[PDB]
Design an enzyme around this catalytic site. Structure first.
Site, PDB file in Angstrom:
ATOM      1  N   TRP B 135       0.952  -1.185  -0.009  1.00  0.00           N
ATOM      2  CA  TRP B 135      -0.064   0.092  -0.115  1.00  0.00           C
ATOM      3  C   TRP B 135       0.956   1.302  -0.111  1.00  0.00           C
ATOM      4  O   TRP B 135       1.751   1.468   0.916  1.00  0.00           O
ATOM      5  CB  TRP B 135      -0.985  -0.062   1.138  1.00  0.00           C
ATOM      6  CG  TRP B 135      -2.038   1.033   1.419  1.00  0.00           C
ATOM      7  CD1 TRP B 135      -2.682   1.567   0.289  1.00  0.00           C
ATOM      8  CD2 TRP B 135      -2.349   1.699   2.481  1.00  0.00           C
ATOM      9  NE1 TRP B 135      -3.527   2.516   0.737  1.00  0.00           N
ATOM     10  CE2 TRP B 135      -3.365   2.651   1.992  1.00  0.00           C
ATOM     11  CE3 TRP B 135      -2.046   1.745   3.967  1.00  0.00           C
ATOM     12  CZ2 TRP B 135      -4.231   3.674   2.791  1.00  0.00           C
ATOM     13  CZ3 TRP B 135      -2.870   2.475   4.718  1.00  0.00           C
ATOM     14  CH2 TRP B 135      -3.752   3.211   4.231  1.00  0.00           C
ATOM     15  N   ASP B 217      -0.540  -4.739   9.949  1.00  0.00           N
ATOM     16  CA  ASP B 217      -1.580  -3.986   9.458  1.00  0.00           C
ATOM     17  C   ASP B 217      -3.010  -4.943   9.338  1.00  0.00           C
ATOM     18  O   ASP B 217      -2.670  -5.803   8.263  1.00  0.00           O
ATOM     19  CB  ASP B 217      -1.305  -3.258   8.178  1.00  0.00           C
ATOM     20  CG  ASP B 217      -2.248  -2.452   7.583  1.00  0.00           C
ATOM     21  OD1 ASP B 217      -3.421  -2.281   7.952  1.00  0.00           O
ATOM     22  OD2 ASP B 217      -1.874  -1.672   6.500  1.00  0.00           O
ATOM     23  N   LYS B 253     -13.572  -1.786   6.096  1.00  0.00           N
ATOM     24  CA  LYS B 253     -14.192  -2.608   5.108  1.00  0.00           C
ATOM     25  C   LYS B 253     -15.089  -3.920   5.639  1.00  0.00           C
ATOM     26  O   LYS B 253     -16.197  -4.001   4.888  1.00  0.00           O
ATOM     27  CB  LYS B 253     -12.886  -3.304   4.370  1.00  0.00           C
ATOM     28  CG  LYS B 253     -11.839  -2.677   3.331  1.00  0.00           C
ATOM     29  CD  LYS B 253     -11.091  -1.755   4.363  1.00  0.00           C
ATOM     30  CE  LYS B 253     -10.124  -0.688   3.433  1.00  0.00           C
ATOM     31  NZ  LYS B 253      -9.212  -0.357   4.231  1.00  0.00           N
TER      32      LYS B 253
HETATM   33  C1  LIG Z   1      -7.927   3.155   4.974  1.00  0.00           C
HETATM   34 AS1  LIG Z   1      -8.697   3.088   6.463  1.00  0.00          AS
HETATM   35  C2  LIG Z   1      -7.980   1.117   7.441  1.00  0.00           C
HETATM   36  O1  LIG Z   1      -7.720   4.001   7.660  1.00  0.00           O
HETATM   37  O2  LIG Z   1     -10.253   3.204   6.542  1.00  0.00           O
END
Ligand SMILES: C[As](C)(=O)[O-]
Ligand SMILES: C[As](C)(=O)[O-]
Lengths: 405, 404
Positions: B135, B217, B253
């Site tokens: 990422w 993560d 998510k």
């Molecule tokens: C991209 As997020 C895990 O800070 O909503």
């Protein structure tokens, strides 16, 4: 320092936040008491006061079925636009400024202090804070990388008023092109603001010294009960051509403490640089929290934007400001009836949520030990008082003064 | 030499734009038939944003509770924290031996965690290792937290389109003892390639032997395979092997709470006195940044985690989301087989989670984009933005790209 366990064992602890701690002690405290630590509004019964217009907005918002998709980095644009319009007036040209949603005022202060390090040399350029000021201001600014933090005179501890001559001297004595963090209205902790004419003199000095102005606007509405009235200094500085950086909070005036709704805005003189400044703000946000929480901004947008909710909100805030004055008058009147030594007119002349009482650290310690929880600097959240505890506050002040001083 | 403020602002250096941002904008503005597979959010079988039914239920339940808006503690809403950490580790010995706070989702936990680690390691000298690839915001977050020696460990095998486990191991061993490793807990982003259980165990062993600090993560638990247990394997295994796991958790998510920013940062650490010191540093870092976290997202996730009936509903609703992603992977695969597109395509069904490295060259990805199939130039597609219809379109455009 070989296994990870050994590495963690050496981590240095940090002292806890005195305010947030004291509030915890107060909240745990026993019999009759006055929890006057944090600047959070309380009603006539001394209870938390979710606003009626916010309860209306909750239901409106739920019925709309907005989705939960990521906001842009900059946040929820309908809220940002209305919020900037609330402080600068319906006159303001949204196109000539840069503005983002932030994690309330704290978030806008941190973000703005970091941003400024990309324009000023934070290793050398001083940043000036009021004497006295929110002790978290110093912490935020330091964490953002400011290495020479200074003070401008502001409050006169003898007269219990503004030290305007001292403030002007310090503005003029600072090196050109310094940063000044100013309270837009309802100075915290003193509750004393410049007059209109004094604000115009400050603007002219800021211009002549090429200083950067950073406004903290956390209490708009509480100085007078009127949002438009309380925006005077920001609007003046804008009209005078100052490239105002401004941090805005909806925690107190809309009671959205838990939802963390605010903005950071810059009046940028050169419109061609707006994109570049937005790109820095967006990279700073992206590397911290990616994008801001939507719920608080959605609620506030409905209240700002709808003409009925907006007028109901302004009436509700006006009433809140008025209950605070009633509490000031109740405390003051009792201080007079007890003939407490000294002058106490500052209790009723100060504005905002607080009174800066002028008691010694020992008199403040006395108070805390009789369940009147004011800060060690003598700051009291008047908005925490009921008629019962306003009288207790006066009685305890009277006792503290007569027995320690 | 700038003098006035306007002259100083004139000199500010614009910061280059996220190329994913620009692509996503192109994709969102595009007309004609298309597949916008750029950004990573779940879409339903009609291609639409999907607020979870259990989240809509929880919204109404929270309103009926007549809650106030007073500040949360600096560390956040403690019932949410407790349920969130119980979700990743289970109801186990860990729950008393950890320190945890609420954060502004995963991103917030990653930034807080990376800053925290500069108080235990010398961020000037100690290397921090990111996956190859990872990422892109990982790099930004760590750099901004003060890490000066940012490195990478081999992870994806660009030839085999699977995991380069030998290369990963070599980089773990070749790094200096006591380095920091940012590991994707499950559903690696951008590739969809994960180590096996037995491979995770070898990794734990290597991390112990080298005294590396593990930073997980964890953005996709449950969402990756459909099972919260399955998807928590690495974290639980590492915990059981005695590793002091630092872990960044997101509900964006797996509950669809992208906009409400609910997450946690937790550290597994035995000594209780040191737990409180770690806590005090976490709270200091929070306080100077945003004072305390927003409540609405935390109150939604806590109610869904804790209410036995909502919890059961949610796990079923999440299982179906995960299944639908697999379904889309299956559709694309079958069509590529059906069309007899040259090459191997089994990685499309072996990869897990939202993202797939399709295995296309840069020129082929450009071809996809110019035909309104918006995938990144590195070949990353959001499978979870496909419908049956655009799944077939993708497979057909891939088959064209490969052939010309
Ligand atoms: C991209 As997020 C895990 O800070 O909503
Ligand atoms: C202290 As605030 C203005 O971030 O709620």
């Amino acid at each position: 320092a070989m296994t990870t366990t050994e590495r963690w064992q050496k981590i240095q602890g940090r002292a806890p936040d005195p305010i947030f701690e004291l509030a915890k002690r107060a909240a745990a405290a026993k019999g009759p008491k006055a929890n006057l630590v944090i600047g959070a509004y309380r009603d006539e019964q001394g209870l938390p006061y979710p606003l009626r217009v916010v309860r209306k907005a909750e239901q409106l918002l739920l019925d709309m079925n907005l989705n939960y998709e990521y906001l842009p980095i900059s946040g929820y644009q309908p809220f940002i636009d209305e919020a900037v319009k609330m402080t600068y007036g319906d006159t303001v040209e949204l196109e000539n400024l840069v503005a983002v949603q932030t994690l309330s005022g704290t978030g806008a202060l941190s973000l703005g202090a970091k941003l400024l390090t990309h324009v000023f040399d934070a290793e050398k350029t001083p940043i000036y804070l009021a004497d006295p000021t929110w002790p978290n201001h110093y912490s935020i600014v330091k964490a953002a990388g400011w290495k020479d933090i200074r003070t401008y005179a502001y409050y006169d501890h003898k007269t219990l008023g503004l030290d305007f001559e001292g403030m002007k001297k310090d503005i003029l004595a600072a090196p050109d092109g310094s940063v000044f963090l100013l309270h837009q209205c309802a100075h915290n902790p003193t509750g004393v603001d410049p007059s209109q004419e004094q604000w115009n003199e400050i603007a002219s000095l800021m211009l002549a010294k090429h200083h950067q102005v950073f406004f903290d606007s956390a209490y708009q509405g509480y100085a007078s009960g009127s949002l438009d009235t309380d925006a005077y200094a920001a609007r003046l500085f804008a009209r005078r051509g100052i490239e105002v950086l401004l941090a805005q909070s909806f925690s107190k005036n809309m009671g959205l403490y838990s939802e963390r709704a605010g903005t950071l805005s810059l009046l940028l003189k050169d419109k061609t640089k707006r994109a570049d400044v937005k790109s820095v703000m967006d990279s700073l946000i992206r590397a911290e929290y990616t994008c801001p929480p939507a719920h608080g901004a959605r609620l506030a947008h409905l209240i700002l934007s709808n003409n009925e909710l907006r007028k109901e909100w302004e009436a509700e805030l006006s009433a809140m400001a008025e209950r605070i004055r009633t509490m000031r008058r109740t405390v003051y009147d009792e201080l007079l009836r007890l003939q407490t030594p000294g002058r106490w007119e500052h209790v009723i002349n100060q504005i905002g949520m607080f009174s800066f009482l002028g008691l010694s650290k020992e008199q403040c310690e006395y108070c805390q030990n009789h369940n009147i929880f004011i800060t060690l600097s003598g700051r009291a959240n008047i908005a925490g008082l009921t008629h019962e505890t306003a009288l207790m506050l006066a009685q305890t002040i009277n006792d503290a003064v007569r027995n320690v001083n």
